[PDB]
Amino acid sequence: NPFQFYLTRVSGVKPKYNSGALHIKDILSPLFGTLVSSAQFNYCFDVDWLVKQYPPEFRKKPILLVHGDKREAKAHLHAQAKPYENISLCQAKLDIAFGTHHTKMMLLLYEEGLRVVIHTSNLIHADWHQKTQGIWLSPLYPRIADGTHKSGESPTHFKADLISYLMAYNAPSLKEWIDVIHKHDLSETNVYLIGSTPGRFQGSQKDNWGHFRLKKLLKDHASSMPNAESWPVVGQFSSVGSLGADESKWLCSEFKESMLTLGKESSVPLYLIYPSVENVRTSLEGYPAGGSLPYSIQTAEKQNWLHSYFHKWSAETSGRSNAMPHIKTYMRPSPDFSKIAWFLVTSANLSKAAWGALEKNGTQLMIRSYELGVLFLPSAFGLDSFKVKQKFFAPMATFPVPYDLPPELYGSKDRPWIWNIPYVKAPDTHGNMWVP
């Protein structure tokens, strides 16, 4: 696998569907490196559970938790961590209203080098138990020898781009990690970093983050093909924000416009994949899986137009149709879904807060949140396109798409999962209804 894209282990599927999956205990195992220090960037943490996922011999090594909590939530997190003298915390600034520290990333410093893990799971038991989640594992990056002057940079600019992402926090604990990264050789990295950080970006900075970052990379490092208007866009996510009163306000005007960019020189089909109520009810977790699919009735009722874009969750290819998705992915398949022009795994949901919204007569991109993902482009692997792998766990130049293509449209009786209304008509796989 050149791609190093993994799913998390799912309890309850046959072993064939976890052969090649990773649990958090595997990621932190001594087989991956002799841990010296780690940083855990996330949204939600269960600290007692998290420490138990580290090998016993590594449980006292320094851990930095990077989070966005304020006020009582911040106090609760500090209270969770206080029994562990080796745990430090970094509160990421969220100076624009309604922002979230959503990025899920591990920085793992070893005696042997450094590893970066960019993934989709919160650091709680339920997120690694019966969900579909995605992981990108970096190579083991060796240390640059003291006295040697080299950039350690990759053709995708990943080292500088990761440092730039961390610099945006303006945090002393993260400057320490910046200095660690500077000392390592990241040149083998074949993915492009796509981050969001809170702010109002103009001029040159507009291409640094969010959907304009994606657009810039696709303009510079992808090529248009004949009949590009027939290559769909697919977005797949676990949460939906307020997108406006119709598709022209944001979804099709700026979001889709960035995602359909190819090369330097619209009828494009847009497929959005989001679990139906039936997908949740019949899932391994049952209705409680919907606690991790935040879409509120107050938001949904203002944008019923959006639901005509929605397609069911189906993942026979990876044995995961009943493992509800908390992964987020975006990609550009060919008209027959046999190839893809690129693939992105990210924390970013279908949200203006995550991807950015244009302001000031189109001159400023405003982002509310921290997000992070990695983009797989054929050019970074010496290819014009990626073949789609037919079975996720079954020539290595085929990309492992973790759900089924083509996506299947909701049926007339299907409805999107909305987390804060009751479902009391049919019981779930555990015999229960949903009463928020």
Binding-site residue ranges for substrate? 104, 328
Known active-site residue 311:
no
Cα–Cα distance between 223 and 379 in angstroms, integer?
Answer: 9
Token pair 């409805």 is at which residue? Answer: 415
- Tell me the closest approach of the beta carbon of residue 274 to ligand K8J, in angstroms: 11
* Ranges within 161-180 binding ligand K8J (CB under 6 A): none
The residue (of 122 and 138) whose beta carbon lies closer to ligand K8J is 122
Q: Which amino acid is at 424?
A: V
Dihedral angle, C-alpha 413, 418, 421, 426, nearest 10 °: 40
The residue (of 53 and 154) whose beta carbon lies closer to ligand K8J is 53
Cα–Cα distance between 319 and 321 in angstroms, integer?
Answer: 6
> Quick one: which of 238, 318, 322, 334 contacts ligand K8J (CB under 6 A)?
238
> Quick one: which of 102, 131, 332, 389 contacts ligand K8J (CB under 6 A)?
102
β-sheet bridge partners, residue 350: 240
Task: Give yes or no for a cis peptide into 378 (omega within 30° of 0).
Answer: no
Cα–Cα distance between 93 and 101 in angstroms, integer?
Answer: 9
The residue (of 299 and 429) whose beta carbon lies closer to ligand K8J is 299
Residue of 67, 101, 102, 119 marked catalytic: 102
Tokens of 381: 């692997």
* Ranges within 273-292 binding ligand K8J (CB under 6 A): 292
The residue (of 103 and 189) whose beta carbon lies closer to ligand K8J is 103
What b-and-e string marks burial along 394-406, b requiring 16 or more CB atoms within 10 Å of the CB? eeeeebbbbbbbe
Annotation: binding site: 104, 328
Residue of 67, 119, 211, 326 marked catalytic: 326
The residue (of 241 and 400) whose beta carbon lies closer to ligand K8J is 241
- Tell me the closest approach of the beta carbon of residue 350 to ligand K8J, in angstroms: 10
- Tell me the closest approach of the beta carbon of residue 62 to ligand K8J, in angstroms: 24
Kindly report the number of other CB atoms within 10 A of residue 79's CB atom: 10
* CB 234, CB 268: distance < 8 Å: no
- List strands edge to edge, sheet with 364-367: 199-202, 364-367, 357-359
Q: Is 269 in the site for ligand K8J (CB under 6 A)?
A: no
The residue (of 89 and 350) whose beta carbon lies closer to ligand K8J is 350
Q: Is 40 in the site for ligand K8J (CB under 6 A)?
A: no
State the binding string over 350-369 for ligand K8J (x if CB under 6 A, else -): --------------------
- Tell me the closest approach of the beta carbon of residue 122 to ligand K8J, in angstroms: 5
- Tell me the closest approach of the beta carbon of residue 410 to ligand K8J, in angstroms: 20
- Tell me the closest approach of the beta carbon of residue 147 to ligand K8J, in angstroms: 42
Cα–Cα distance between 111 and 145 in angstroms, integer?
Answer: 14
- Tell me the closest approach of the beta carbon of residue 6 to ligand K8J, in angstroms: 18
The residue (of 124 and 383) whose beta carbon lies closer to ligand K8J is 124
> Quick one: which of 239, 317, 318, 334 contacts ligand K8J (CB under 6 A)?
239
Give one DSSP letter per residue of 312-375, joined into a string. Answer: ----GGGT-TTS-B--EEEEEE-TTSSEEEEEEEES--B-HHHH-EEETTTTEEEE-SBEEEEE
Residue nearest to ligand K8J (CB): 43
Secondary structure of residue 116 in the 3-state scheme: strand
Q: Report how far Cα 115 is from the mean position of its chain's Cα atoms.
A: 17
Known active-site residue 326:
yes
The residue (of 156 and 347) whose beta carbon lies closer to ligand K8J is 347
> Quick one: which of 100, 130, 279, 329 contacts ligand K8J (CB under 6 A)?
100
The DSSP letter of residue 411 is P
* CB 130, CB 323: distance < 8 Å: yes
Tokens of 81: 């961590």
Q: Is 122 in the site for ligand K8J (CB under 6 A)?
A: yes
> Quick one: which of 43, 212, 330, 343 contacts ligand K8J (CB under 6 A)?
43
- Tell me the closest approach of the beta carbon of residue 239 to ligand K8J, in angstroms: 4
Tokens of 386: 């990626």
Kind of pairing, strands 339-346 and 357-359?
unpaired
* Ranges within 292-351 binding ligand K8J (CB under 6 A): 292, 294, 349
Maximum C-alpha span of the chain? 69
For residue 167, the surrounding DSSP H or E stretch is: helix 158-167
Q: What are phi and psi of 410, to 5 degrees?
A: -50, 145
Which residues participate in catalysis according to the annotation?
Answer: 102, 326
**Residues near ligand K8J, by CB under 6 A:** 43, 100, 102, 122, 238-239, 292, 294, 349
